[PDB]
Scaffold this active site. Structure first.
Site, PDB file in Angstrom:
ATOM      1  N   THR A   1      80.202 -66.434  38.671  1.00 30.81           N
ATOM      2  CA  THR A   1      80.213 -66.888  37.382  1.00 30.81           C
ATOM      3  C   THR A   1      78.842 -67.826  37.105  1.00 30.81           C
ATOM      4  OG1 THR A   1      81.884 -68.121  36.010  1.00 30.81           O
ATOM      5  CG2 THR A   1      81.418 -69.041  38.295  1.00 30.81           C
ATOM      6  N   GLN A   2      78.595 -67.906  35.790  1.00 24.46           N
ATOM      7  CA  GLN A   2      77.349 -68.716  35.469  1.00 24.46           C
ATOM      8  C   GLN A   2      77.752 -69.870  34.337  1.00 24.46           C
ATOM      9  OE1 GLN A   2      77.022 -65.304  37.433  1.00 24.46           O
ATOM     10  NE2 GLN A   2      77.077 -64.949  34.976  1.00 24.46           N
TER      11      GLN A   2
ATOM     12  N   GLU B   1      71.008 -63.787  34.774  1.00 24.01           N
ATOM     13  CA  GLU B   1      72.265 -63.426  34.010  1.00 24.01           C
ATOM     14  C   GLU B   1      72.751 -64.647  33.263  1.00 24.01           C
ATOM     15  OE1 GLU B   1      74.819 -62.102  37.084  1.00 24.01           O
ATOM     16  OE2 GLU B   1      76.379 -61.565  35.699  1.00 24.01           O
TER      17      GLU B   1
END
Ligand SMILES: Nc1ncnc2c1ncn2[C@@H]1O[C@H](COP(=O)(O)OP(=O)(O)NP(=O)(O)O)[C@@H](O)[C@H]1O
Ligand SMILES: [Zn+2]
EC number: 3.6.1.-
Length: 422
Positions: free
Chosen positions: A172-173, A130
């Site tokens: 969250t990335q 992702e």
């Protein structure tokens, strides 16, 4: 110019969106050539929200899939690849019940296979997937993978790349090119794109997506205060405790009432203290960390912050009318927002009010995540832009995913460009 098409369904934790991409047949391997053609938002929740009724997951995609049949020319349906990729909502459901997860993937698969596109599968992406695919989307669309200059005079150092920060609903990335040595193989990424090697760091924080953070703050406020200091004074709601504690992200907080009244107090300082409990900075088994003992080298270079980073910043600038150009301005805007009463906040938003009581908490979370969590300071924060689109294409992982699976970014240029980049 004959065009080709490809379709990705982004099956996120809170929503499914459909992206149709298009590109010219004989220029398909040029960087930045693929762009968005159309898109569709699926009504209702994400596919993981059908964990107890998996049939409805597939059915939910029908209206947007009908739009794809009209958006892509009929004579190209058969040869247009269609992918579905699912993210942290499905990773969380997989922790709770691999069997319910499998039944949802089966139901979307059955629906998708009834359509005339070349369906190539429904998969759960990893957190690394992702992060990295979002970084590839942004850099591909902005042509950062072009080797700039000409023979005898190449720009040096080579063109920088844009770091990516994605704030989804359940994880969250953060992903960026780095020159620091890797200390955790889980975070280390190496890409070979158009003849160039990119050393990248990525990490995905599960349970640190917007909706899960709000659930965690709600659990915490219930335990510690019995009021919600991030919610605006005059706002209250009947909280059903079973929904609060059912998430893998909150079951760790469980403290025999089914429903409790909870009211806001507009207490920006107590809100800041509630949010600070989200970040464990007590230990680091590496040379340096972000938080929760996760390795992270120093942030560096420009970044694009999209998804709920963009939506929250857009609320602060456009609705509250506050500047957010510095970390100090962001902190001040958060304080002002959190101190508004519910009648004052509603006076600024003449239309639908969904999410409005939550902006204070989400803005506080983003400020702490960037400053306390990732260790941005004023100098590094100046290089962050909040944007959700580039070159008429939504920024997210979907395009980079489609590029990888369709093999549309070459490892090397044709003929190695006669070795002129060596
Ligand atoms: N137009 C909008 N305005 C304000 N907030 C929004 C908007 N669209 C989505 N959001 C919120 O922003 C958060 C992230 O949205 P999105 O990036 O669609 O997450 P996702 O893909 O559904 N989740 P994940 O599976 O973790 O990546 C969610 O909590 C949404 O409710
Ligand atoms: Zn997402």
């Amino acid at each position: 110019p004959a065009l080709k098409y490809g379709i990705v369904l982004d099956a996120g934790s809170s929503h499914t969106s459909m992206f149709v991409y298009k590109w010219p047949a004989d220029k398909e391997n040029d960087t930045g050539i693929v762009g968005q053609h159309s898109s569709c938002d699926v009504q209702g929740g994400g596919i993981s929200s059908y964990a107890n009724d998996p049939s409805k997951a597939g059915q939910s995609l029908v209206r947007c899939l009908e739009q794809a049949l009209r958006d892509v020319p009929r004579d190209r349906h058969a040869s247009t690849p269609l992918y579905l990729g699912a993210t942290a909502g499905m990773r969380l459901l997989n922790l709770t019940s691999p069997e319910a997860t499998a039944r949802v993937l089966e139901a979307v698969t059955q629906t998708l296979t009834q359509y005339p596109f070349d369906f190539r599968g429904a998969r759960i992406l990893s957190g690394q997937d992702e992060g990295v695919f979002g970084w590839v989307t942004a850099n591909y669309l902005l042509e950062n993978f072009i080797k700039y200059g000409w023979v005898g005079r190449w720009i040096r150092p080579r063109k920088g790349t844009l770091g990516a920060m994605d704030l989804g609903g359940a994880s969250t990335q953060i992903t960026f090119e780095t020159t620091s040595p890797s200390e955790d193989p889980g975070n280390e990424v190496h890409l070979r794109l158009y003849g160039q090697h990119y050393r990248v760091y990525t990490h995905s924080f599960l349970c640190y997506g917007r909706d899960q953070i709000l659930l965690r703050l709600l659990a915490s406020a219930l335990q510690i205060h019995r009021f919600h200091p991030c919610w605006p004074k005059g706002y209250s709601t009947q909280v059903l405790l079973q929904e609060v504690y059912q998430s893998p992200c909150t079951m760790g907080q469980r403290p025999g009432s089914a429903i409790v009244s909870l009211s806001g107090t507009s207490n920006a300082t107590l809100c800041r203290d509630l949010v600070s409990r989200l970040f464990n900075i007590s230990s680091c088994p590496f040379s340096q960390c972000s938080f929760n003992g996760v390795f992270q080298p120093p942030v560096a270079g420009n970044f694009i912050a999209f998804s709920a980073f963009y939506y929250t910043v857009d609320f602060l600038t456009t609705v509250m009318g506050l500047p957010v150009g510095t970390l100090k301005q962001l902190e001040e805007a958060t304080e002002i927002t959190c101190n508004q009463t519910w009648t004052e906040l509603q006076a600024r938003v003449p239309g639908q009010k969904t999410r409005l009581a939550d902006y204070c908490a989400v803005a506080m979370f983003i400020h702490q995540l960037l400053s306390r969590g990732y260790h941005f300071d004023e100098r590094s924060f100046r290089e962050v832009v909040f944007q959700k689109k580039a070159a008429d294409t939504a920024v997210g992982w979907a395009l980079g995913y489609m590029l990888n699976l369709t093999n549309l970014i070459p490892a090397d240029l044709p003929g190695l460009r006669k070795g002129t980049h060596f």
